Design a binder for this molecule. Structure first.
Ligand SMILES: *[C@@H]1O[C@H](CO)[C@@H](O[C@@H]2O[C@H](CO)[C@@H](O[C@@H]3O[C@H](CO[C@H]4O[C@H](CO)[C@@H](O)[C@H](O)[C@@H]4O)[C@@H](O)[C@H](O[C@H]4O[C@H](CO)[C@@H](O)[C@H](O)[C@@H]4O)[C@@H]3O)[C@H](O)[C@H]2NC(C)=O)[C@H](O)[C@H]1NC(C)=O
Ligand SMILES: *[C@@H]1O[C@H](CO)[C@@H](O[C@@H]2O[C@H](CO)[C@@H](O)[C@H](O)[C@H]2NC(C)=O)[C@H](O)[C@H]1NC(C)=O
Ligand SMILES: *[C@@H]1O[C@H](CO)[C@@H](O[C@@H]2O[C@H](CO)[C@@H](O)[C@H](O)[C@H]2NC(C)=O)[C@H](O)[C@H]1NC(C)=O
Ligand SMILES: *[C@@H]1O[C@H](CO)[C@@H](O[C@@H]2O[C@H](CO)[C@@H](O)[C@H](O)[C@H]2NC(C)=O)[C@H](O)[C@H]1NC(C)=O
Ligand SMILES: *[C@@H]1O[C@H](CO)[C@@H](O[C@@H]2O[C@H](CO)[C@@H](O)[C@H](O)[C@H]2NC(C)=O)[C@H](O)[C@H]1NC(C)=O
Ligand SMILES: *[C@@H]1O[C@H](CO)[C@@H](O[C@@H]2O[C@H](CO)[C@@H](O)[C@H](O)[C@H]2NC(C)=O)[C@H](O)[C@H]1NC(C)=O
Ligand SMILES: *[C@@H]1O[C@H](CO)[C@@H](O[C@@H]2O[C@H](CO)[C@@H](O)[C@H](O)[C@H]2NC(C)=O)[C@H](O)[C@H]1NC(C)=O
Ligand SMILES: *[C@@H]1O[C@H](CO)[C@@H](O)[C@H](O)[C@H]1NC(C)=O
Ligand SMILES: *[C@@H]1O[C@H](CO)[C@@H](O)[C@H](O)[C@H]1NC(C)=O
Ligand SMILES: *[C@@H]1O[C@H](CO)[C@@H](O)[C@H](O)[C@H]1NC(C)=O
Lengths: 145, 445, 145, 145, 445, 445
């Protein structure tokens, strides 16, 4: 469907394009930098114009930092290798008590993010604790055997 | 029995402010050919977003602020390596240019002479040159000085550098996307249902003007009047026309340009003399096109101010030329046109072109800043340019007593309005790929 | 306990805060940058002051490089998804012959790092080789089946 | 064998040095930066010379971006934790119909990359799709159980 | 049967040198209000480290060097866009200011006139102004020049920019942490057992002085004497008081400031004349507070030099004003006070304030560098400021023959000492989250 | 039944262009001691690549372009903080230096006087100095000006900064590697079978010259003639010798240097007078070494132009000194030597050193740019230097009618050739660790 082609799709259907969205950040970084590297005069511009050169580095550094921040969160939650991962944290009806079929078949991800936008930090804290406990349990199983 | 499931690569976003890339269409010495050095895509292919509604607000659009900052920065950089003209802050001995001069030009142009520096510190040279009166003021065969000498340094713009605007495309950095509104009736704010995502905007020429909006895009179907608040007389109204009005501008005097060294490689340009007679600079529009254009604007103003009320047009209320006249760059020359010839009508329930006399200035205080002033070198020969009026900046006087008659004037002058009128359809958002949702799935324990 | 709250704790107890420490680097990067992004005048400062703008980028780039270096080491040792991982490299009494219970119940991580500070590069080289051998063995098992 | 020591080796033998090559990028980044950090006058140079300071940051940022781009590709293909990984995408004789034993025992990786240099983008697209399908299948297995 | 287990997120660290963020408490034109643009936290919450002992060393603390570098850099930047005063390197015709002048001011202030530039190159203006003798030297109704003209360019500090120090907090970048020592008796080196971790230091005002340490923090409980080496007479002793001493400083002369253009927007400020009589600038402390303060310092010096030995105080040994006097910035003015009135006593086994006469200078060689000099514009009116002495920089003369009498003098002048005295409690460390340990666990094969 | 298997850490690479680190061997005020501040490894250990063949092309080697850019940038930076000499663009009153002057020096050196600025704007001083005629031109006891005053600003190189080249090593950034060709017969292009990988090149001294290549490396075994195209007379031929030729250069005149202030700390240096007689600067080579060297070059040229054809040498065809003479920096002085004494022979099927007279210039247009010119301050005393000719830049005239006689001249002057001749053995490649291959392995499902 293309980048954000699934934005108006319902969540269920939209999940089949997670790869499209996931790659867009670093792919875009290397292609944009390539267009810049392919123009020797533009490279001269990066040094000739101090402010422009700084603005470009700032933008690139920030883009990398955001990529990594999200990757670390997946890492600490035990989802580093997955686009889709299930965890051991139960869903709270206080975050949302909406019917599961509406959530996946009628709603889009944009609507959904709004639906639960004030619980993000709660869920993330819970995911962190759950994974921490799980890893300790795994070590105990290995010491036991 | 719902559990948290985490998804990465979720197609959602948030409003955001970032730095956009400036990219040209791949004009050897044009300042815009350079700088916006990263080339655009041959096909900046657009992706339509089916069933996506998003809210746009042109008066909160930070793309405008970025362009404004970049326009200023680029100009300051382009003048950085050019010859300073501080040696010109000398007393001048001036008289009236005397030739076959029309009435409207009497005293308009002055004939000045002065002792200028040369490449050696021990030598001076006599320079004879012509200046427009707007650049020269009295000190007290009379004593004059350049107008800027009591405020700031004057520098010469390099004659080899073109500032002719070419289309500029702004492109999002990776991690960001630009949402484009295709609603033909979009008035600058609120939800838009026909939205596509692009990596780059279309090209916008960075055209600068103060009253009439020149060389922009046209509206489809009808004239669109966009303002932050209709009833607020403190706000500007940006009118986007659905048809263009052609303007033919001239600087009818055939100028001879002289060039001297005033230092070590420091070349200075000035008007030496004028060939032929002396005539006033001016711009023409047909009366019919102009009158039809206003009639269309009025039909649309009436939807906001009443279709049984009276709309009249009047000229500028006051201020300096940078405020009261229509200013534009014509081939490197700077024109200040008297638009009272256009905004003179009352609307109620064989071209005879309107001729606007224009003044010319060489010392330009760009962006209305107090600081370094620019000297526009003279142009050899006769200048002609033709521009398209694609819009107007109007202000309502307000002060209304509900008399049923409202007055609009060619106000504005805020340079950001010139770009807001083109960038109104774009929004920048940050991509937020990480999120969660419930499901009947638990991690295997 | 907070960031480094466990610094004076013994190693055993301290391991329960590995998540606290792990997130501090990238979390701090995004929050500090946010405070900078939220101050338009400060953003103007980044370009107006060339040296300050360079110092800030240098600091951010370096912080990212250190994050990644450590992540790669975990990657090559087969610990990319773990805060705690056991490997196939035996412990050498020549590095430390101290009692295991003192190490986990009495000593802190600060003390411990000093105890074995001259063997770090040895252990890391051994971990690299062990993982390399393991992956080849895994491929051989798949070709066999 | 050292960095690129295996470059003239055949592919089979060369695979035993994947760790050597893999670490060279970030290891080199931190050691080069260390040599720079250890020279206070050089640090002064980074700010005194605007263009030099910008060139150095540009080089470092670019090196990081390339590292990450490759890591993400391994991530989306389900190979984030491996130097060697097998996938579910069959080999096409149209890319290469050369004998497997020549490929691993006689040819070097340099020769091989040339042999299949025009199919890289095909293979990568196939790997992306295969992993996407696999992850959905895994979620379906968990919802089923 | 122990195996290697790798742990990530280990709470350990190493000594390190990095770049800290400068953050203000969110003074419109103050140089310190700006620059340190990232705001501090409303609550830079501290985390105490239970059972952590760490070693601190204030004389090896690289936070001092960073502050020093940043102080210099910021000042050089703030003067960058200001008017250069190189047109002032002209010969001056000077005589003695003649008015109701007290004895201590005879010949102190000179009345000079000169030909100064104007906005036009063809015109000069006569400027009449007053200068302090310290800024003006003879060339041979006598011929004088500004003191800096044979060494370096002089530039005017912008009158609109305040340099008044405000508290500055330094914050660690992510990946680093600041360890704070709370041991009330900490002497600058060695282990500290009450240690907390913070992301930001408390605010330190970047106050500059040469002898008395002004507007710093006070010690708790007792005066603390900190030196790199007690018996090394080549080292400075930083004395932190546990009580403050108030100093009342004045510039009693009511000055009239004149301002002229010396070029295109180049405004220059100078003292035109003085209203009222002429008096010498001075600073007051009560005698009792000063004498009690020294008695406390002596009790503590005796723990290092013998409680049966004699401690005497004496004035500066020699050098320029920047070396021998107590220098400080009072509302933008630069004072050089004679502290011999303070350091005059021998300690063995009704305020009558001590008045220190002070000299004033307008040409300042900041940081004792040879290079661009700063011109401090004059201040209109009468100047008053009140400062707190929070410490002293003392040096022991040494050269001792074990006579049992030691002499201390108000030496120092190394600007880094002014900050070392506040940053002594902080250390910067790098976080090292990756490490290994033995356990009875093997990876499943 | 083959499947795709992905491998990471694959030992392959691609041609690439990146930025290399400049690293010195860890000359206090030498511009090359600084800048290339990252120290090299004590052992930049080389890794031989067994069974690797790679293609090199010295005329496409982007390492040359980087060095060129860095050489220019460093020089422009080093002159940035130095005294400008624009006050010297005054009229000069000049006569011929009259002393015991040899015939070859008659009119070569001029005795000039002028009004120079001082630290005060009101005072001038008379300066008497000597200039070489090449730096001074007539305006019309005769009137002269410095040659640069009609083109560009002149600045003084700081006398405290040394530009003496020291070996520079270029190092690849992480992610890149440098491949080094060890084939002793490598002619600049094509495959090389003895290839090693290094992180840093050997040190190359950034020696600048126009005709003879000085202080480079020598070829092993035989003279190697390398050119982009043998039959293209538009291309330069770089000849690398396998033996060195020693050149002894002198500036025989014992100069007395004077120094004055021309502004606030603005010290200016000039030759005041000369002690002893006046002699022409010159360089010596033995005739035997030079004649043997050419015989070797000819034997090798004959492999390309025919071993039954005639090779003759001739001097420069025309152009300015920067083009026609052999230019080099000798202890900070700038020499322009007449090489017609060397390139005068026809080759067919008791040292008597050749003496090349040399001219001296103080105003140098480095890199043949039009823009800021450099003033080389004079050097006190007598100058001696000894250099090694390690190569030649030759051009074939072409225009051949197959007469069987070809002519070669000491052409060139393109500074990049000086480095291409050393960097010819290095290539920069990007490491590409990710790739795929077939195998009998499928992921477990
Ligand atoms: C090709 O390579 C050769 C070397 O292999 C270069 O030749 C050298 O060039 C340098 C620079 O011109 C010469 O350095 C100068 O030497 C003068 C004489 O010094 C004698 O006494 C000292 C005592 O300590 C001995 O060490 C030395 O060997 C000599 O016997 C000095 O008076 C000069 O001083 C000036 O410069 C220094 C900074 O370097 C300042 O600090 C001083 O105040 C002063 O201004 C200087 O040191 C060197 O002697 C030459 N070597 C030889 C063997 O002759 C060629 O120049 C190079 N060719 C090219 C084209 O690059
Ligand atoms: C503008 O002023 C200049 C300067 O006086 C006039 O130039 C002179 O014209 C007379 C008459 O042709 C000549 O004899 C002189 O030699 C000219 N002087 C110089 C310096 O060139 C010029 O004519 C004036 N032009 C107008 C339109 O008033
Ligand atoms: C340029 O400078 C000369 C100075 O030589 C000016 O001519 C002088 O003008 C004054 C004022 O009337 C006379 O007192 C002098 O006798 C004149 N000198 C000579 C020799 O001409 C001249 O007017 C200046 N020109 C301008 C316009 O700047
Ligand atoms: C400082 O010098 C100035 C310059 O001479 C003195 O100003 C003059 O004072 C007399 C007496 O009141 C006036 O008549 C003149 O008109 C003033 N001249 C100018 C240029 O203003 C001033 O009085 C001197 N002040 C002191 C204290 O010595
Ligand atoms: C400013 O310049 C004028 C020059 O006009 C100086 O006054 C001259 O001084 C000299 C030296 O005594 C006399 O020979 C001239 O006759 C004076 N000219 C006139 C008309 O006054 C004046 O002294 C200078 N002022 C200062 C202090 O720089
Ligand atoms: C170069 O020119 C200077 C300037 O005239 C000559 O210096 C003078 O020499 C005579 C004779 O010895 C002295 O009486 C003068 O006092 C000197 N004048 C100055 C200003 O110093 C110098 O002799 C000339 N040199 C040559 C070689 O021609
Ligand atoms: C420096 O300036 C002085 C000006 O005082 C020059 O000397 C003058 O030269 C002119 C031209 O011959 C004479 O008309 C003046 O009478 C001279 N004045 C005096 C008092 O000497 C001098 O020649 C200049 N020197 C140089 C070489 O620049
Ligand atoms: C838009 O709505 C229609 C009607 O329900 C639906 O068939 C279509 O798939 C939707 N588009 C997207 C992108 O979900
Ligand atoms: C400090 O020591 C006491 C006494 O053994 C212990 O109870 C306490 O938990 C220790 N604190 C930490 C952080 O380990
Ligand atoms: C080079 O070729 C020889 C002969 O086949 C072989 O024995 C040797 O291992 C090869 N070198 C490498 C690096 O593969």
């Amino acid at each position: 469907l293309g980048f954000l082609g699934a934005a108006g799709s319902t969540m269920g259907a939209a999940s089949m394009t997670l790869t499209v969205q996931a790659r867009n950040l670093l792919s875009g970084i290397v292609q944009q930098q390539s267009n810049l590297l392919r123009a020797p005069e533009c490279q001269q511009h990066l040094l000739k114009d101090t402010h422009w050169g700084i603005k470009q580095l700032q933008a690139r550094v920030l883009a990398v930092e955001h990529y990594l921040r999200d990757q670390q969160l997946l890492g600490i939650w035990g989802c580093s290798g997955k686009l889709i991962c299930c965890t051991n944290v139960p869903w709270n009806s206080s975050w949302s008590n909406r019917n599961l079929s509406e959530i996946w078949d009628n709603m889009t991800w944009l609507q959904w993010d709004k639906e639960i936008s004030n619980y993000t930090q709660i869920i993330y804290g819970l995911l962190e604790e759950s994974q921490n406990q799980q890893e300790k349990n795994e070590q105990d199983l290995l010491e036991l055997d | 029995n719902l559990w948290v499931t985490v998804y990465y690569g979720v197609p959602v976003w948030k409003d955001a402010e970032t730095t956009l890339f400036c990219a040209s269409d791949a004009k050897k010495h044009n300042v815009w050919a350079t700088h916006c050095c990263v080339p655009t895509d041959p096909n900046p292919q657009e992706i339509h977003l089916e069933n996506v509604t998003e809210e746009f607000n042109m008066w909160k659009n930070n793309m405008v602020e970025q362009m404004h900052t970049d326009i200023i920065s680029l100009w300051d950089q382009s003048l950085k390596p050019c010859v300073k003209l501080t040696p010109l802050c000398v007393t001048l001995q001036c008289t009236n240019v005397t030739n076959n001069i029309t009435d409207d030009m009497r005293g308009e142009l002055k004939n000045c002479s002065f002792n200028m520096t040369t490449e050696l510190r021990d030598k001076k040279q006599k320079v004879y040159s012509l200046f427009y009166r707007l650049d020269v003021v009295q000190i007290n065969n009379k004593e004059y000085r350049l107008i800027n000498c009591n405020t700031s340094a004057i520098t010469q713009a390099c004659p080899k550098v073109s500032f002719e605007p070419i289309p500029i495309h702004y492109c999002a950095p990776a991690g960001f996307a630009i949402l484009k509104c295709k609603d033909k009736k979009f008035n600058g704010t609120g939800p838009c249902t026909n939205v596509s995502t692009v990596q780059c905007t279309h090209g916008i020429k960075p055209v600068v003007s103060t009253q009439l909006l020149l060389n922009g895009s046209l509206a489809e179907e009808e004239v669109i009047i966009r303002s932050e608040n209709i009833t607020n007389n403190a706000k500007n109204i940006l009118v986007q026309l659905n048809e263009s009005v052609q303007i033919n501008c001239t600087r009818p005097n055939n100028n001879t340009v002289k060039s001297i060294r005033i230092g070590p490689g420091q070349w200075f340009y000035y008007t030496g003399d004028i060939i032929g007679d002396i005539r006033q600079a001016h711009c023409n529009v047909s009366k019919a096109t102009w009158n039809e254009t206003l009639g269309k604007v009025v039909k649309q103003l009436r939807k906001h101010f009443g279709n049984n009320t009276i709309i009249r047009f009047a000229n500028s209320s006051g201020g300096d030329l940078e405020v009261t006249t229509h200013s534009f760059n014509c081939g490197g020359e700077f024109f200040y046109c008297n638009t009272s010839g256009l905004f003179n009508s009352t609307w109620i329930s064989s071209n005879d072109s309107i001729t606007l006399p224009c003044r010319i200035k060489q010392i330009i205080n760009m962006w209305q800043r107090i600081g370094q002033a620019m000297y526009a070198p003279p142009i050899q020969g006769v200048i002609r340019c033709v521009s398209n009026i694609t819009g107007l900046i109007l202000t309502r006087d307000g002060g209304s007593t509900n008399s049923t008659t409202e007055t609009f004037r060619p106000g504005g002058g805020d340079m950001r309005d010139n770009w807001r009128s083109e960038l109104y359809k774009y929004k920048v958002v940050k991509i937020e790929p990480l999120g969660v949702a419930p499901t009947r799935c638990k991690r295997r324990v």
